[PDB]
C-alpha cells in the first residue's frame, strides 16, 4: 500500500509568489485530522443523527529543526510574522495519469511547539487548522526532493576531496 | 468462536447503484459501539433506572490506505464529497441456511484521520455514526474477497514470467 | 477463597418463559459495580455525610462471541430487539444448605461493544445497569455447565471416529 | 517502621451487639484518605489560605472474597441491607502501655465493587466515607487473628489424619 | 524404569477418519511440558499462593524427516493446510490389564522448524500446544511399529536377492 | 549540585514552644510546588499577560510511618487535633557564612493519606498548603540528624552485648 | 540539524543592569510552547476558521539546582521577590553573519516546582509565560559557557595539586 | 531419510525474468522457521488455546561468499538495491512422479551479515522473512547443480593441460 | 597476597547474646558484592554522571551442610525463624597492630537454597543483603578455627584407640 | 571463494584531506551487520509482512593496538576528538575490470572498547554505525599493504646488519 | 604491537595531595569501555543515525588483593569512605618525545566485588564509571614499578641471609 516514506508534505507560502514549494527535511511524523460534523439527536425517529454538517479540518506537523533551511524559515515567517501558508501533501510514487498525486489546501499556523532536550535533537511540533483540504493530482514533481531522496552515499572519494562530517565535500 | 479474520466489513455507496459492495484491503481493526440509553434516576422507587430509551450507534474503522483502491475511493467520495454509505459487516464462515451472515445499516462519515509516520505505512482512522445497525443474513458472498483470501502464494513461476514485487506477474 | 472460575453468571430472558437460563461460553471477565449514594455535606456538624441514600447498580460483561450460541442470541435479542433480561450470578462451589449460591436481579442492556481485531478473536463488551441486585441461594444447578466444565479431553478415540477440530467427533 | 502486615483493619457491626469485631481474611490493600479543608484565597494579604476548615474522611478497602466468612457477611449485610459499620484499624505490634494501638470510627458503605476474572480469584473493592476517624489504643487483641497469624504449617501428619486441600484436616 | 526407547508418540489426524494413527520414524526427542498455574501472592496470610489455577500444556517434537512417509505428510497437512491433530503417546512395554498405556489429547501445530545442515541429515523441530493431555491405557498396539521395532537385520541373503542400500531387497 | 539526600525538611509545631524542630525518619520524597499567578489576557496589546499576581504555594510530603516517633506525632496532632505547623526545609551541606541554609514558612495540613499494603511498609502521603515560604539561612544544625546520619554500622560487638534486630543493643 | 546540546537558554534580569546574562548549569530540558489563536467557526462558508488571532506564548524550564549559582539566584529573586526576567535562547553553533543566533523576550515566573527525591538530585521545574518571544541573532557569545563547555578533563595533575572531588583543584 | 546434502535451496529473482534460478555454492547451513500463531488464553474453559491463528514464516541462510557468482550477486542486488527474491528449496533425490520436490515462496532480505575473520573464509549470514512458503514438486532439475555435484575430480591430466589451483584447467 | 583459605567469614546471631561467633565448616565459596549508586545522565555537561549516590550491599554464601553444627543451626534459626545475623569476615593472617583484620556488618537472610544431588554432598546456597558492611580490625581470634585449622592428622594411634571414620577417636 | 585474509578494511578520515586511506595492522576480525527493516504484521491478508522498510547498518571492528600507528591514531582522533571516518572495505584479489573491489561508506565511532589482559596483547573492540554502506569497485590499490603483505622474511642478513627483534634492521 | 604487560594502570587519590600515584600489584585484567552515543532513527532520510551524541565512559578493574598495600587501601578509602580517584593508564614502553604515554581521567567507584574461593586467591572486581578519559603523554615514570618489574630473582644468597618465602630476605 502507501509507505510511511511514500506520502510527503510540501508547503508554499502565499507572499513568496515563486514557482516552487519548500518542504523541510528531517520529518518526524504527520497527522492530518478531518472532522465531518453530523446531525444531533435522532429523537428516536427515522435517523436524525445521520445528517450532513460542517467539517473541521486540522493537522499537526512534527519535525526536527535544522539550523537554517527554507521551509523552516517559511514556518518561521509563517508563525512569527503571522501568515497563512499554502498546504500540499503529495505521494512519492509516480502517478500514471499525472506527475504525482496530492491533497492541497490553504493552512494557518494554529500553534508551534519547540522542544530542546539533553538527548537527541531539537524537535518542533507545529499545529495548524485548515478550511478544507481537497484531493487532486500533484503537478510539480520537484525531483530534487520527492523524486530524489538519497542516503548521502557516493561511490568513492579516495584521493582526498577535502571532506567533512557532511556526506560529500569537495576540495575547497 | 468467531475469529479476528472471520468478521469482515464491506460498504456499498448509495449513489453508485451497482450490484456489489467494495471492501477495502489491509484492515487494521474495527470497533462498532452501540449505546442503548436507559431510564434516569430510580428515585429510590421500584426501579426507574431499568427503563427503555433511545440507542446511540457509532463505529470507527482503522485501516492502512492503498495507493488507489475503490472502497478507499468510496471512502474518499464518502468524506470529501459528503455522502452517507451503506454499511455491511458479514462473517466469512458460511451460513448454513443463508449465503453468509451480516449486520447492515446506513452510515455516515463522522470523522476521518490520516497518519503518515516515518516508520510503517500510512494509516487511516475513519469514524462514523449510524442510525441503527440491524442484524441479518448476508446474501452476497462476493467470493473474490470473503470466500477467497489468499496469502499471494502460487505453485511455481520457474521459466521466468516477468515478475516483480507483486505476488504474481505474467510476461508483459 | 472464591476462585476466578468459581463465580459464573447466567441470564434468563423474560419473554422466553422457559425453565432454564442460558449462560454463554468463553467468558473474559465480569465487573459488577454497586454504588450506594450517601449524605451530602456534613456542614461541620455531628456527621451529616454518613447518611443513607439510593443505590446505583451497574455491571459490564466482557466475553468472546461464538458463531451461534443461545445466551449470545439472548444478548442479541436483548439489545437488538430491546428487552430486559433476568440476571443470575452464582457460584460453582456447592452450597451446603442449598443447591448453589447466587445473586439475582432484573437487568437491561445499557450498551454493547463489538471489537474485531486482526489478532485474537471477536470480543464483545456489554454494559448494563440494574435496579437492585439481591443475594440469595441458587436453586438451579444446570449441571451441564456449572457442575460440569470439562477441558474437552476424552480417554481415546483410536479406531477413527470421524474426528475434526472439535474435541470429540463421532463417525458421521 | 510499621510493616505492610503490621497494620490490620477490623470492623464491628452496630446491630450485632457482640463483644467482638470480625475482620476478614485475604486482604489485598487498604487506603484511608483524610482531607482537611482549608481557607480559600489569600487575597494577597497576610495568609488567608492557611486557615481552618472541615475534614472529609474516606477510605477504600480491597480484598479477595472467601466463599462464606463473617466480616464479608458483615460487609454483605452492611451494603445490601444498608447499615453503617463500626471501623477499627489496629497494629499487630504489641502496645507497651496498651493491648494494641488503633484508629477508630463509625463508617458507611459508600460503594462496593465485585470483579470476577478468568485469572486469579474474586476481588472485592469496597469504598466508604467516615465522619471522622480518631486515633486511640486498641483494647481487644483478638489473639486468634492479630496475635496469631500462621502460615498454615503444622509439624507432621504422618499416620494419615484424613487430610484435604486445607492446611490441617483430622480423621473425620 | 521406563527407557528412552520405551515411550513412543503416535498422532492420528482428525480429518482422515481411519482406524489407525501414523507415527513417524527417526525420532530425535520429545518434550512434553505441562504448566499448572497457581495462586498469586500469599499477602503474608495463611497461604494464598498454594491455590488452584488453569493449566498450560505444550509440547515440542523433534525428528529427522524422511523423504516421504505418512506421519510427516500428516504433519505437513497438519501445519501447511492448518488442522489440529489427535495426539497419542504410549509405552512399548505391554500393559498387564490393557494393550498398552497411553497419554492422549487433541493437539495443534504451534510452530514447525526445518534445519538443513552440511553435516548430518534434515532435522525438523515441530512445536505444539494442547488443551489438556489426559492419561489412559493404549488400546491399539499397532504391532508393526511399537510391538515390532527391528534393527533391519535378516538371517541371510546369499543366492543374491537383488539387494540395495535398504536392509532387505528382493529379486525385482 | 544538591543531592537527593542533601535537602531535608524539618517541622516545628507552634504550640510546643520548644527550642527544637522534630523531623521524621524514613523519608520517601518531597514535593514543594509554588505557583506565581500572572496577568490574564494580553488583548493583543503590548504584553498584558506578563504582569504580577498572587502566589499559590503548596507542598506534599510522603514518608513511611514509624510506630511512634515525634514528628509523626507532631503530624498526628497537626492533622487530627487541627493545628498549623512551622515549616523548615534546610540543606545538609554546611553553609559557609551560616550554620545551614533553609527555606522557612508556616504550613497547614491540607490532607493526609495513609496506605497499608500487603507488600512493603505503611506509607503516609500528607499534603499541605502554605501562605508563602521564604528562603533564609538555617541556624539550628540539630547535629543528631542533619549533621549525623549514619547507616547504623558500629565497629564490633563481639563479647555479646544483648543484641536484637536494631543496629546496636547493649546488655540489658 | 540542531543538536540537543546546541540550543541553550540564558536569562538576564531587568534590575541587575549588567552587561551579561547568567545561564544556569545542569540543564534537564526546555519546552517553549507558542500558541497562535485562530478564527472560530467557519459557519460552513469560505473558511472563517483560517483567520488571524492573538498568540499565547509560554515556556517551562527544568534543571537540577546547584547549591549556589547566579542564574538560580536570579531565578530565586525572580520568583521569590517577584520580578520579570529578560529571556534569551541562543544556539552554540557560530552564526556566519552574526556572533550567535537567538530568540529573545521578556518573561515572567508563572510557577516554580521543587522536587527532592531519595534518588538522584534536586530538580527544579520552573514555568513561565511570555508576551511574545522574537527571533534574532545573538550578539553576546559569553565564551565561558556557550563557546566553552568542557567535560572537566585536564591533561595531568601528577605532583599533587591539593585535589578534591571537583575536576581541578590547585595547592591551597 | 533426507540427508544434509539432500535438501538444497535455489532462488530466482523477480526482475530477471529468466527461465532459471541461480543457487549459490559453498553453503554453510539453512534454517527455515515457521510459526503458526494460536489462540490466547483458555480461560479455564473447553480449550480456547488450541485455536487457529496467523503464521509467521522466516528463514535465515548462511554461506561462504565467493569472489563473484550470480546467486550472491542476486543476493547483492536483493539486499543492496532492495528487491524481493523468489524462494525455492528442493530435494536432490529424484521425485518418482515429478522432476524433483520443492517448497516455494516469495521472500525478502530482512537482514544480511558479513563476517571477515583472520581464520577461515568470508562468511555471510542473510536473514529473510516470507509471507507463506508452500510445498510442491520441483519442475526444474537444473542438472548442472542439483543433479550434478562433483568433487572436482577428473580421471587424469598427464601431458600437462596448463593447470592451476582449480580442479581442471586446460591449455590456454 | 591474600589466599583463598586466608579470608574466612564468621557470623554472630543477635539474640544469642554470647561472647563468641559461630562459623560453619566445609565452605564452598563466598561472594560479597557492593554496589555504589552514581549520578544519572551527564546531560553532555561537565560530568553529571560521576556524582555520589547510595550503596546497595549484598552477599551470597555457599557451603556444604553438616548434619548438625551451630552456625548452620544459626543459619536455620536465621532463615526459618526470621532474624538478622551479625556479619563478620576476617583474615586468618595475624594483624600486626590488631588480633586479626575484619569487615563487619548486620545482615539478613534474603534467600536460602538447598541442593541434594545423587553425586557429591548436600550444598546450601544462602543469599543475603546488608545495610552497609564496614571494615575494621578483628578482635576475637577464636583460635579453635581461624588460628587452628588442621588436616585431621595425628601422629599415631597404634595400640588401638577405638577408632572410626573420624580423624581421631579414643577408647570409648 | 573469498578468504579470511582476502577482504580487508581501510578507513579514510574526513578532515585529513589526503590522497590515501590508513588501514591498521594486526586485525582480529570484522563484523559488518546490515538490517533491512520490513513490514509489520500481515493481518492474515495477502502478505503485509514482506514490505519494504528502512535499513539499520552497523559494524564492529576488533584489532590488537600497536604502540603508535596512523589508522589507530585515526581511530583515536575518530573517537576521542569526535569525528566520523570514511569507511572502505576492499578485497585483496585483483579486480578484472577495476583495480580492486570495495564496499564504501561514511561511518561513526559508536563505541570503543580497550582490553588489557595479563596474557596476550592489548585488544581494541571498536563499534560503529553507518548510514548506508554501498558496494563499488576499489580504485586505490595502496600496494604497500593490500597488494604487498609479507611474512617479514628476507633472504639473508649474514655479515651482521645491526639487527633487532624487528624482521629487518640495517646497520645504524 | 602493545603487549598485555605493556599497558599498566595507576590511580592517584584526590585527597592525598602527594606527588605520586599508587598502582596495585597482582593485576588480573583491565577493561575500559567507552560508548559514544549517536543519532536515533534515520527516518529513511539522508542519514540521521550518523549524528553526534554524548559519551558514556566506564571501566572495570580486576585484581588479586594483597594483605595490605596502598593502591588497595586507596581503593578501600575510595569505595568505603566514598571518594573519586584520579585515573591514569600508561604504557611501559618508553615514549620517544615524552617520559611515557598515558590516558588520564577522574574516576569513581561504581561497584566493588570481593570473591573468596577455596581454590586460588582472593579476587577483587572493581567497576567504575568516568566522565571522560582523555589521552596524553605520561610524565611520571615511577621507575620502581613501570620501569622496573622484576621476577624476584637475585644472583645468589649463599652464606645464608636469613631468608623466607619472599624473594629476598636479609639477616634480621
Author numbering:
A (entry chain D), B (entry chain E), C (entry chain F), D (entry chain A), E (entry chain L), F (entry chain B), ...: 5 to 176
Kindly provide excerpts from the paper associated with this entry.
In this work, we set out to expand the labeling strategy for long-range distance restraints to further methyl groups, as well as to integrate the NMR data with a 3.5–6 Å cryo-EM map for hybrid structure calculation. For the collection of solid-state NMR long-range distance restraints, we overexpressed a set of differently labeled TTP gp17.1 in E. coli, purified them, and let them self-polymerize into native-like tail tubes as detailed in the “Methods” section. Torsion angles were predicted based on assigned backbone chemical shifts. Hence, these samples deliver a set of restraints that defines the relative organization of gp17.1 subunits within the tube. During structure calculation only the structure of a single monomer was represented and refined. The structures of the other subunits were generated by applying symmetry operators to the subunit structure. We represented two stacked rings in the structure calculation. Each ring was composed of six subunits such that interactions between twelve subunits were considered in the structure calculation.
In the Siphoviridae SPP1 phage, the tail tube consists of the TTPs gp17.1 and gp17.1* in a ratio of 3:1, with the latter being generated by a translational frameshift adding a fibronectin type III (FN3) domain to the C-terminus of the protein. However, virions only containing gp17.1 are still viable and infectious, indicating that the additional C-terminal FN3 domain is dispensable for phage assembly and infection. gp17.1 monomers are unstable in solution and spontaneously self-polymerize into long tubes in vitro which are indistinguishable from native tubes. Six gp17.1 subunits assemble into a ring with the inner 24 β-strands forming a β-barrel that defines the inner lumen of the tube. The α-helices are arranged almost parallel to the tail tube axis. These rings stack onto each other with a rotation of 21.9° forming a right-handed helical, hollow tube.
